[PDB]
């Protein structure tokens, strides 16, 4: 029995006859490019992409963010072209390219990266790490403004926090500095939150820092809502993610329900829903900045648990499921003597009546 | 007479598990003589070309592209002789994982 295909065959486009006239690729790299291009198309048959978790496939991404900067394309292209011509005009550039000895100022490369495509790259890191999924669900934003977080360890030691970094709580015991470029015409809101680490509720998150109504760059002069608290992961479950979010707000908004007290060590009080909090004040705030880091357990977590929060410190463990065994048969056929050891309860000789 | 040795029983080569069947780690999903079903995700390969499940879960059968090993000379020569619009397609056996890797349990509060 033969059935009709539901759509086109993959190789039915090319002609079977006159094989010599058809051009061939002679490169395995050309096949690698062609096959990786072919594997990304939505075929009508059953695919790996359908079965192995493509995360709903095509998704209509709701954008809650700042407008992209309007830059004149023709002027940008001509200034890039003229810079390139003046770059190829030099002979010492040819010498350094030929003799395999040339270096680039990676600090200036990083600065131009932060100005140009750093927002889109940090957006795709946040999409990969699931920052949008557990904060705004299907909603996403482009981190338009540059944002720098740094932790002062001592006199000169300063530990940065970039996207997806890894910072030990010994570095993060004290309050960080935050640097971003803004004029004095806007209002800002900085919020450090721990997405995973809530004990009772799996869908809720912790506030570790919150400052609101920031005049421009100056974070300190802004009104202080929630106190800074050192990172406290569990000893067993490591790598909790801590996210700094920066929101641009137009009007001066004061909270009477979101205000937290001065010591404020109660984790029942420190219970957050960033989705509902942005639902409360959607009209004022628009998210513009984001920087997040991973954080595991160290010895400095113990003092935060004991002295600050008055805790007995919980310790977790990564427990795998027990191995599968079939139903035990009365007469196993062609099986080793250790087959009884799979179903033995404990390795202790027990005597029922003796 | 003239023809001898024609008596030989079958080796029972064929498909064992279908799509939708729940298997555990180590279950042989299919056995084959030449490469009829290729191993995919979470499916191992033994030296007699049998396909065995590496993880516990649900078996799937799938059609994808064939990008062979560059050390395999006949395969890469077959790649070289294909025309530019042609791509190889083969079938694959996968096991989607059902159980998670593990869980975190509170063992002691100190």
């Amino acid at each position: 029995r033969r059935a009709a295909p539901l759509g086109p065959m993959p190789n039915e486009d090319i002609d079977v006859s006159d094989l010599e006239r058809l051009k061939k690729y002679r490169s395995f790299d050309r096949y690698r490019r062609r096959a990786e291009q072919e594997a990304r198309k939505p075929h009508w048959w059953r695919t790996y992409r359908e079965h192995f978790g493509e995360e709903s496939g095509p998704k209509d991404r709701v954008d809650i963010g700042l407008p992209p900067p309007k830059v004149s394309r023709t002027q940008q292209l001509l200034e890039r072209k003229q810079a390139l011509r003046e770059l190829r005009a030099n002979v010492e550039e040819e010498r350094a390219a030929r003799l395999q000895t040339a270096r680039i100022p990676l600090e200036a490369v990083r600065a131009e990266w932060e100005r140009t495509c750093g927002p889109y790259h940090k957006q795709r890191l946040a999409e990969y790490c699931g920052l949008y999924r557990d904060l705004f669900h299907g909603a996403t934003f482009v981190p338009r403004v540059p944002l720098h977080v740094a932790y002062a360890v001592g006199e000169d030691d300063l530990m940065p926090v970039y996207h997806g970094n890894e910072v030990t709580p010994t570095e993060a015991a004290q309050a960080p500095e935050v640097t971003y470029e803004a004029d004095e015409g806007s209002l800002w809101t900085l919020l450090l939150t721990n997405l995973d680490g809530h004990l009772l509720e799996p869908d809720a998150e912790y506030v570790h820092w919150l400052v609101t109504n920031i005049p421009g760059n100056r974070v300190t002069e802004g009104q202080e809502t929630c106190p800074y608290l050192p990172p406290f992961p569990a000893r067993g479950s490591g790598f909790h993610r801590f996210a700094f979010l920066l929101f641009k707000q137009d009007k001066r908004i004061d909270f009477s329900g979101d205000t937290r007290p001065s010591p404020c060590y109660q984790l029942a009080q420190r219970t957050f829903h960033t989705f509902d909090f942005y639902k409360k004040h959607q009209d004022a705030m628009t998210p513009a900045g984001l920087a997040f880091f991973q954080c595991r357990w160290d010895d400095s977590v113990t003092r935060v648990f004991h002295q600050l929060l008055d805790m007995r410190e919980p310790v977790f463990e990564f427990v795998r499921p027990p191995p599968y065994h079939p139903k035990q048969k009365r007469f196993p056929h062609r099986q080793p003597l250790r087959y009884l050891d799979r179903y033995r309860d404990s390795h202790e000789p027990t005597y029922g009546i003796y | 007479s003239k023809n001898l040795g024609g008596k030989s029983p079958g080796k029972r080569f064929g498909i064992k598990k279908m799509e939708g069947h729940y298997v555990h780690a180590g279950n042989i999903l299919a056995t084959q003589r030449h490469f009829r079903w290729h191993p995919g995700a979470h499916v191992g390969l033994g030296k007699n070309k049998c396909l065995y499940a590496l993880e516990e879960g649900v078996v799937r059968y799938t059609k994808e592209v064939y990008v062979p090993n560059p050390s395999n000379s006949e395969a890469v020569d077959l790649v070289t002789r294909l025309p530019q619009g042609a791509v190889l397609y083969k079938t694959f056996v996968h096991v989607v994982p059902a159980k998670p890797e593990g869980t975190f349990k509170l063992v002691a509060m100190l």
Binding site: A3, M9 | K63, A86, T91
Partner: peptide, 21 residues
């Protein structure tokens, strides 16, 4: 399989041949 609509998706020998006036 024969009865499936995805029959002959692995057909390759018609594209490569390997076997004057």
């Amino acid at each position: 399989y024969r009865s499936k609509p995805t029959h002959g998706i692995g057909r390759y020998k018609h594209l490569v041949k390997a076997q004057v006036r």
